[PDB]
């Protein structure tokens, strides 16, 4: 219902994070960030309200109600997996007992299933972040109002690799640097194809359950061409499939972390009224409020058995 | 061309089946950078 705008946001956010610097690894969670600012979208007043929905690529043809309820069916569908893969999302809101409007409370309790001393608050927040993510995000405090969200992912490959064919092969970093990483090896039938619009190989490996990973191997020099012409319409076309060829797959194992504070990037996406003095947060409190930072952290793990990822957001 | 090696920097998506929304997106340039 809101997934086409959700992928466009994931790509708009991806471009600026990658355009900022292409010299390091990138890993973030679009759903966690989207829910964080969509949760705040219910407690914000005009001209900050609007910039928030527009910054999530939403106003034009959809009402504000149908947007918030898309996220309740979103988070309910994700928090209800047919458990072969482990997937859970959690929303937190750490108030400090002053003043609340209590209409913001009823809205976030319904739509998003949400649940001074610096040391006590810091330890309490990070335990809530480390509890749901199974200790993946452990070390992710300013003032009265804090909103936190977390996601946990743990799936297994439909056709797992064997841990004897994983040989250490070269990895081309920048046409001068070459590092050796443990690459997994497997032959057989794969859901692989060529775009002819992206100049890149597109490989889909489905996880056991309701999840699927897509891998884009760009041609020589076409890495930037891939990042610019990658849209929602093309991935849905790729997800309509079962044209499977056969090839030998060399997939490297992975373990990386994102750790982005992104107050600056969102301004480039239209959310400028985020930490502004003039920014209006009236649906939240009756005493008065503004944001100071927006930190996002996410970890990834790829092995022969499956994938284990977890992301968190702190506003 | 059955020689698909991921020895170059690449981009990956991690999308849910039933919801069709991307849960994770990333770009791998160096696996050793952990």
């Amino acid at each position, epitope marked *: 219902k809101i997934t086409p705008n959700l992928a466009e946001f994931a790509f708009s956010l991806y471009r600026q994070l990658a355009h900022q610097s292409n010299s390091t690894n990138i890993f973030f969670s679009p759903v966690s960030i989207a829910t964080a600012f969509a949760m705040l979208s219910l407690g914000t007043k005009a001209d900050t309200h609007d910039e928030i929905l527009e910054g999530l690529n939403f106003l034009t043809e959809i009402p504000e109600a149908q947007i918030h309820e898309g996220f309740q069916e979103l988070l309910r569908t994700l928090n209800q997996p047919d458990s072969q893969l482990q997937l859970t999302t959690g929303n937190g809101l750490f108030l400090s007992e002053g003043k609340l409007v209590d209409k913001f409370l009823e809205d976030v309790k319904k739509l998003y299933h949400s649940e001074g001393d610096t040391e006590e608050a810091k330890k309490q927040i990070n335990d809530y972040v480390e509890k749901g993510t199974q200790g993946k995000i452990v070390d992710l405090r300013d003032t009265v109002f804090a909103l936190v969200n977390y996601i946990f992912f743990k799936g297994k490959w439909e056709r797992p690799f064997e*841990v*004897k064919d*994983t*040989e*250490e092969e070269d990895f081309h970093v920048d046409q001068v640097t070459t590092v*050796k*990483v*443990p*690459m997994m090896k497997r032959l057989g039938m794969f859901n692989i194809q060529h775009c002819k619009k992206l100049s890149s190989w597109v490989l889909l490996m489905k996880y056991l359950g309701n999840a699927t990973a897509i891998f884009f191997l760009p041609d020589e020099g076409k890495l930037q061409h891939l990042e610019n012409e990658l849209t929602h319409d093309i991935i849905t076309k790729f997800l309509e499939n079962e044209d499977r060829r056969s090839a030998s797959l060399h997939l490297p*194992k*992975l*373990s990386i972390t994102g750790t982005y504070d992104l107050k600056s990037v969102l301004g480039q996406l239209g959310i400028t009224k985020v930490f502004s003095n003039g920014a209006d947060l009236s649906g939240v409190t009756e005493e008065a409020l503004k944001l100071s930072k927006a930190v996002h952290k996410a970890v990834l*793990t790829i*092995d022969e*058995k499956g994938t*284990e990822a977890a992301g968190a957001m702190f506003l | 061309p059955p020689e698909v090696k991921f020895n170059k920097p690449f981009v990956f998506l991690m999308i849910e089946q039933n919801t069709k929304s991307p849960l994770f997106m990333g770009k791998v340039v160096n*696996p*050793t950078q*952990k």
Partner: antibody, heavy 112, light 108 residues
């Protein structure tokens, strides 16, 4: 990767070895312990996959030795218990992805 | 449990001479065999993995072949930095067992 913690242990005692590592990820490689008996016979001791699952043990040491990872501090562990005279050997911590590289070892001496 | 028989247990050779040692398994191991070298005062170093693919950094003097149950290590032109004990590794199935070891010594 440089391992340490060896020494002399009385029969029936216990000891825990450590293999700290730097220069590579250590969170992406499989780790293992391998020993070298005084008779110059090498034999596999432990095998932990990457992350923590799943550990493998031969029947000679199953139930007595326990391998564990600490990827946060980049340290491999080998909890030894119920040691016998056969356990006296030079132990090695090994990272393997097809090719594996061993440390310089640490000597365990189990005698009364 | 696959027993790895390695022959011979000890042999002499001279500089530049061709040396060939063999490692036979108790069963088929699908060519998952690795060859090690140990200096007397230092730790084993990996030379070959998958029984025909050299480890990066090893001189091209070391060859190796074999299939199923009989595998061999060959040095085309022996050197003085190659004298030591050679071990053959089995990693086709758990537990991973090694060979008895081949002692390569210098002759004069």
């Amino acid at each position: 990767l440089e391992e340490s913690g060896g020494g002399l242990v009385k029969p029936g005692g216990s000891l825990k070895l450590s293999c700290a590592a730097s220069g590579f990820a250590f969170s992406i490689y499989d780790m293992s312990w391998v020993r070298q008996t005084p008779e110059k016979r090498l034999e596999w001791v432990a095998y932990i996959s990457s992350g923590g699952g799943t550990t493998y043990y031969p029947d000679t040491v199953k139930g007595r030795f326990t391998i564990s990872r600490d990827n946060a501090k980049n340290t491999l562990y080998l909890q030894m218990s119920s040691l016998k005279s056969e356990d006296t050997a030079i132990y090695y911590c090994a990272r393997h992805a097809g090719v594996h590289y061993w440390g310089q070892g640490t000597t365990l001496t189990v005698s009364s | 449990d696959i027993v790895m028989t390695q022959s011979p247990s000890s042999m002499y050779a001279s500089l530049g001479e061709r040396v060939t040692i063999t490692c036979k398994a108790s069963q088929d191991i699908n060519s998952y065999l690795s060859w090690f070298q140990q200096k007397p005062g230092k730790s084993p170093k990996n030379l070959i993995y998958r029984a025909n693919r050299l480890v990066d950094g090893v001189p091209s003097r070391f060859s190796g072949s074999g299939s199923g149950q009989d595998y061999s290590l060959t040095i085309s032109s022996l050197e003085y930095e190659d004298m030591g004990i050679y071990y053959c590794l089995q990693y086709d199935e758990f537990p991973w067992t090694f060979g008895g070891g081949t002692k390569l010594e210098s002759k004069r």
